[PDB]
Amino acid sequence: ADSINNFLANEYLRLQSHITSRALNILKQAQAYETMNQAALLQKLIDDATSAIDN
Amino acid sequence: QAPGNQDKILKWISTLSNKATTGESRSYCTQLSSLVSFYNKQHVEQIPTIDFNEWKSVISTQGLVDKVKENYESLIKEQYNTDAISKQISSASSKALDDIENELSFHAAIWLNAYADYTMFLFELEEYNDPNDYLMHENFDFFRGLETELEELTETHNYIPGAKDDVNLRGYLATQFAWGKKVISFYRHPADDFKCAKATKNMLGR
Amino acid sequence: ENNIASNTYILIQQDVANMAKAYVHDICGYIDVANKENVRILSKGDLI
Ligand SMILES: CCCCCCCCCCCCCCCCCC(=O)OC[C@H](COP(=O)([O-])OCC[N+](C)(C)C)OC(=O)CCCCCCCCCCCCCCCCC
């Protein structure tokens, strides 16, 4: 009984860490793409400037 | 919860393992110890707190930070139902385990009967003191059964003292300085005669 | 007297083979209890 109670207890925390870790990674991962979209947008502006010089 | 909650569980497994002598038993002890360590493994990783307001402010996709929070919180509410499990394990478990529950119970009853025999003997022995201070027929009453055996030796004419006793200690004490030191042979009756005789080509059976 | 394979009623315990074997066959059976619970809780909804 004490081994089952300690198993579900520690196992409950492991699941809790799994969720918050998932919710945090998905958030940080999304931020990474968001920054990439911003850099790609500004990169096009620089690309337009360089092409204007060539013209 | 974390500290000191597994001390007793280690003493039990240790003894169970010490009693194991054959390699087969030692193997089962290893399997048993693993499951205990597996179930009793402690988990401490400092579950981090999420501040959705911080992420919501710095940068996030509209509706995403809020959608993650509401969905995240929903699963956090769910938790294990320790009550249901607590009952099933205590009600009945491992009908195969009932095999040794009833084996060790009868095994213990055997050696509890012996413990009571030795305990009750030392209890009755308290009133018996100084055999040399009791009369003959009174000592035989304390040791009920000797008179019955003594009648068996008499009615079968086994009147050679110590013939039916495996260790006739009284016979060795009387022969400590006897000529031709010998004790009576086991279960020798004063009437049996195994003598033989033969006639050979020579005289005197030689 | 019916459901124990022994050649005598004078039971003498000199090893814990029969004891530990019945424990691993019992405590192990209750494995997957927590993982099974995780299935229900996690299959409830998708975080995304
Ligand atoms: C008192 C009133 C009533 C009295 C009734 C009579 C009571 C008699 C008490 C018992 C006497 C027993 C004598 C046995 C002698 C055996 C000694 C021995 O073992 O020898 C060892 C001896 C000595 O070995 P030992 O190791 O035993 O002793 C060594 C002795 N020292 C220490 C000195 C070295 O070796 C032998 O084996 C020789 C055997 C010779 C046996 C000769 C004796 C024969 C007589 C017995 C037969 C009589 C039958 C009569 C039947 C009549 C029927 C009508």
Side-chain angles (χ1 to χ4, degrees):
Chain A
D2 293 64
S3 299
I4 293 287
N5 184 18
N6 185 267
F7 171 67
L8 305 182
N10 298 121
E11 188 67 8
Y12 171 78
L13 303 180
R14 189 174 74 87
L15 178 145
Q16 290 290 333
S17 181
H18 174 73
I19 296 174
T20 185
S21 180
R22 180 190 287 181
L24 185 60
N25 296 18
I26 184 173
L27 200 168
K28 294 179 176 177
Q29 179 60 18
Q31 180 178 351
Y33 285 155
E34 288 183 1
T35 55
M36 181 175 63
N37 294 94
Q38 183 178 358
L41 178 59
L42 300 178
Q43 180 60 16
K44 178 175 288 183
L45 179 60
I46 278 63
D47 180 70
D48 180 70
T50 57
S51 61
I53 299 173
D54 301 330
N55 300 123
Chain B
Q1 175 179 319
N5 60 358
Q6 294 173 6
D7 300 359
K8 304 183 297 304
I9 299 175
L10 295 177
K11 316 305 180 182
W12 185 87
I13 181 57
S14 65
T15 59
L16 184 283
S17 297
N18 297 336
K19 301 288 284 182
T21 55
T22 310
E24 179 175 2
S25 57
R26 296 173 62 174
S27 63
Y28 289 101
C29 290
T30 70
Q31 307 179 17
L32 192 293
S33 181
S34 63
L35 301 175
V36 174
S37 58
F38 168 80
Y39 286 151
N40 293 257
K41 66 174 64 177
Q42 294 184 357
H43 172 271
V44 55
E45 297 182 0
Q46 187 181 357
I47 278 63
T49 184
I50 299 296
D51 183 3
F52 296 91
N53 299 332
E54 187 279 344
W55 306 99
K56 185 196 299 180
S57 59
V58 58
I59 184 66
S60 298
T61 304
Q62 62 89 358
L64 190 161
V65 63
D66 300 71
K67 177 170 62 177
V68 173
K69 182 177 177 62
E70 60 85 10
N71 193 325
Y72 162 85
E73 185 66 11
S74 64
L75 297 176
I76 298 299
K77 297 294 184 180
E78 299 295 350
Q79 57 180 3
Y80 292 78
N81 50 13
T82 64
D83 192 329
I85 283 63
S86 61
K87 307 309 302 184
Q88 59 180 358
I89 62 97
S90 300
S91 60
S93 177
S94 298
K95 292 290 186 185
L97 172 60
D98 297 3
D99 191 3
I100 63 98
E101 170 68 9
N102 295 332
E103 189 177 354
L104 298 178
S105 300
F106 186 73
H107 166 267
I110 295 167
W111 295 89
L112 286 169
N113 176 269
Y115 197 88
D117 298 0
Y118 313 140
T119 302
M120 287 300 303
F121 169 75
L122 300 171
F123 182 67
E124 305 295 6
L125 193 71
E126 304 178 7
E127 303 177 34
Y128 185 77
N129 68 326
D130 308 6
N132 293 317
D133 304 357
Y134 295 101
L135 293 175
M136 177 272 201
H137 59 283
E138 187 172 10
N139 261 330
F140 276 86
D141 292 3
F142 284 105
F143 300 82
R144 191 185 183 184
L146 294 182
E147 180 179 19
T148 299
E149 297 174 352
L150 194 62
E151 294 168 358
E152 183 275 334
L153 303 172
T154 310
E155 296 301 336
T156 59
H157 274 209
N158 283 290
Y159 55 77
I160 293 171
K164 290 195 176 185
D165 300 87
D166 191 5
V167 179
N168 184 16
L169 184 65
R170 171 61 141 65
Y172 291 96
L173 294 157
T175 59
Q176 285 184 98
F177 312 106
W179 287 14
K181 189 176 184 184
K182 61 184 174 294
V183 286
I184 198 74
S185 54
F186 196 44
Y187 267 63
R188 178 62 177 269
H189 194 277
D192 66 70
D193 196 336
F194 287 82
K195 272 291 185 64
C196 309
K198 64 179 183 183
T200 61
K201 69 184 186 71
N202 307 313
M203 63 149 50
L204 311 178
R206 269 67 181 185
Chain C
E1 68 188 6
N2 292 336
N3 301 313
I4 287 179
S6 188
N7 59 331
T8 184
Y9 284 117
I10 309 178
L11 304 181
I12 307 179
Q13 290 298 130
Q14 64 287 60
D15 194 357
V16 294
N18 54 329
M19 298 170 58
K21 178 177 185 182
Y23 301 155
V24 298
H25 288 57
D26 165 69
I27 192 172
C28 185
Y30 294 157
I31 197 172
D32 195 7
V33 64
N35 172 88
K36 182 180 181 299
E37 184 65 11
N38 302 328
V39 169
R40 185 179 67 182
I41 298 172
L42 296 174
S43 301
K44 180 58 58 53
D46 190 3
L47 185 64
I48 56 77

